[PDB]
Amino acid sequence: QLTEEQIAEFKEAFSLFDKDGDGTITTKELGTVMRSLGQNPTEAELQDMINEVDADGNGTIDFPEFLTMMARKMKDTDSEEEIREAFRVFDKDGNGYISAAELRHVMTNLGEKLTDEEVDEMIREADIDGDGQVNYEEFVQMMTAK
């Protein structure tokens, strides 16, 4: 059930990721952003992920493919591997604590501009104790939400 709002999100979000705006996502584009997250994965991990998301394996990911990928990460969000990968990526400092500055840097580095409020909402809502930081336990619980 794709609503007009959701479709508009892809157009804006996709356009943000696609610098040239060719209507296609290359490895260099996604790879660059995927690396800016303070992570340094090998082409094998990236290519492998793309292939799993590329229903046709054309080497590039189209908007439609992204939608499918989302359903997987959103439906399997309860995957230890997915959570572990996200936790490590999010915690660039490997301190085991997620801050607003770190999160904002990650979610933003996605070619999107989020305000301190947005990030605060994610953490504030994820912070059970309201310590201003989200722990792995809180992350896992917030990674199961629909």
């Binding site: 979610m107 996605l110 947005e118 909402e121």
Partner: peptide, 15 residues
């Protein structure tokens, strides 16, 4: 890639 969605979730609320 969930990262992309993560931004969309918050961004969607902002709009």
């Amino acid at each position: 890639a969930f990262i992309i969605w993560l931004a969309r979730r918050l961004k969607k609320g902002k709009k």
